[PDB]
Design a protein around this ligand. Structure first.
Ligand code: FAD
Length: 440
């Protein structure tokens, strides 16, 4: 009787949790596929992750699923020791990957500042604003101020030179997958807290280990455990929600009565659903503003075998580009992240060549691909990232729902929020527990 909207990782893991508890459920998915913003598909001659790629054993929820579904040894590190190139004052500088990582590491020290005072338990991000907070008032003041400051201004104010500013600009265009200047620095500080406050750990967690058999090995694994068939091609159009239950109406007009609704539709796509009663004003403000998630991910194929890393600041088409696969026909597939989905066509060879031309004039693009999640009606965003003010008055507001409508998804997680499948698996599971505990 529990209706789960969406067959991404949050909805799939919530269904499995309800199944463990003996609670009847149904998953309604708009697309003709499961996985959501995780999507492994053959393109350009090999399986490519069009969304979600990297994992780590320090991500508890993701790692448990890797172990459950047989993928313990089926991980491979992305290429390292690349020849690095970065754009700073309109010019290309060359160096080793170590040289670049050394500059980023120094900048991260200032970027993380305060994380040890804010996040002693990095899974209690709002402890500073709780009644259990016992530190000095200046820590709470700085915490609130940091929600209104972007991560680049922290580096500027610390006196780093233009080269380092341009490097962190590029870095956070990728990390905020959007304009980093509108973002909340508290997001970066919590990533530090979850990464033992070390840049190398943060990159090991978010940008190193890939699944040989893809995210699909995990999402197909969860779906394979479910005893109730997923209803594909069944978009939800309306959710009526009250203290005792809910009523869901699909696009086709079908009415489904529910004891509770677990809604995993991300903010970028919530406007497709009519909520009755209307969602609270503070939650609607977040939906209207969005998340800071307007960027895009590309896969580019070039001739030859090239160990390449490139960084470029806003407003570049792509801000971080790295070699990922060396193919058997003397080509290299590279991944790229850019701040602005509308400034690049992910499937245009000319735009992909323009990306590579940001750093070199001697590399030739032969193929390119990607899926523009921001222009996907059922997503409307890449991974969720925080605008100024959204660390303290954003993601946590979706819990302030008195009715039997529950919001679950990576974007509302306490831990690796938005950026990681770990957050979807966390919040899908704990939202199922909210439903279970209420019924018990
Ligand atoms: C480009 C990109 C790269 C990423 N890389 C990584 C990475 O390297 N590592 C990592 O850990 N994470 C990564 N992620 C993040 C990861 O993909 C997400 O955190 C996670 O997949 C989100 O899961 P979810 O279940 O919360 O939401 P979703 O996956 O968005 O699931 C929501 C589901 O609801 C469906 N839906 C939407 N509207 C409706 C409707 N009206 N009715 C019915 N169904 C509907 C959608 O089709 C979708 O299937 C990346 C994300 C992106 C966008």
């Amino acid at each position: 009787k529990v209706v789960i909207i969406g067959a991404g990782f949050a909805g799939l893991v919530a269904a499995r949790e309800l199944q463990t508890a003996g609670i009847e459920y149904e998953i309604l998915e708009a697309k003709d596929r499961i996985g959501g913003r995780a999507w492994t598909e053959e393109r350009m001659g090999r399986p490519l992750e069009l969304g979600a790629t990297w994992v780590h054993w320090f991500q508890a929820h993701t790692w448990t699923e890797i172990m459950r579904y047989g993928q313990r040894t089926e991980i491979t590190a992305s290429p390292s020791g690349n020849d690095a190139h970065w754009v700073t004052d309109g010019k290309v500088v060359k160096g080793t990957e170590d040289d670049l990582d050394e500059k980023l590491t120094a900048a991260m020290g200032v970027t993380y500042e305060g994380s040890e005072e804010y996040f002693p338990n990095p899974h209690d991000p709002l402890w500073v604003l709780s009644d259990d907070f016992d530190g000095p008032a200046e820590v709470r003041e700085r915490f609130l101020s940091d929600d209104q400051t972007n991560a680049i201004d922290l580096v500027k104010e610390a006196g780093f030179d233009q080269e380092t500013i341009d490097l962190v600009d590029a870095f956070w265009c990728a990390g905020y997958i959007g304009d980093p200047y509108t973002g909340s620095a508290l997001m970066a500080k919590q990533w530090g807290a979850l990464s033992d406050n070390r840049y190398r750990v943060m990159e090991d967690i978010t940008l190193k280990w890939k699944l040989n058999n893809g995210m699909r090995s995990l999402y197909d694994g969860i779906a394979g455990d479910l005893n109730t068939d997923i209803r594909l091609n069944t978009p939800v159009a309306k959710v009526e929600h009250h203290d005792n239950g809910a009523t869901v109406t699909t696009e086709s007009g079908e009415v489904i009565e529910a004891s509770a609704v677990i809604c995993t539709v991300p903010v970028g796509a919530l406007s497709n659903i009519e909520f009755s009663p209307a969602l609270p004003d503070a939650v609607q403000s977040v939906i209207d503003d969005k998340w800071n998630s307007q960027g895009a991910k590309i896969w580019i194929k070039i001739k030859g075998h090239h160990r390449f890393l490139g960084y470029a600041p806003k407003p570049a088409k792509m801000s971080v580009v790295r070699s990922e696969y060396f193919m058997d026909d003397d080509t290299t597939i590279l991944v790229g992240f850019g701040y602005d989905n509308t400034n690049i066509d992910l499937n245009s060879i000319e735009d992909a060549q323009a990306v590579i031309n940001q750093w070199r004039d001697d590399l030739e693009v032969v193929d390119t691909t990607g899926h523009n999640w921001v222009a996907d009606k059922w997503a409307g965003q890449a991974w969720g990232t925080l605008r100024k003010g959204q660390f303290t008055q954003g993601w946590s507001l979706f819990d302030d729902t008195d009715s039997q409508l529950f919001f679950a998804g990576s974007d509302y997680a306490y831990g690796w929020r938005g950026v990681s499948v770990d957050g979807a698996l966390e919040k899908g599971m704990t939202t199922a527990r909210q439903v279970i505990n209420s019924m018990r």
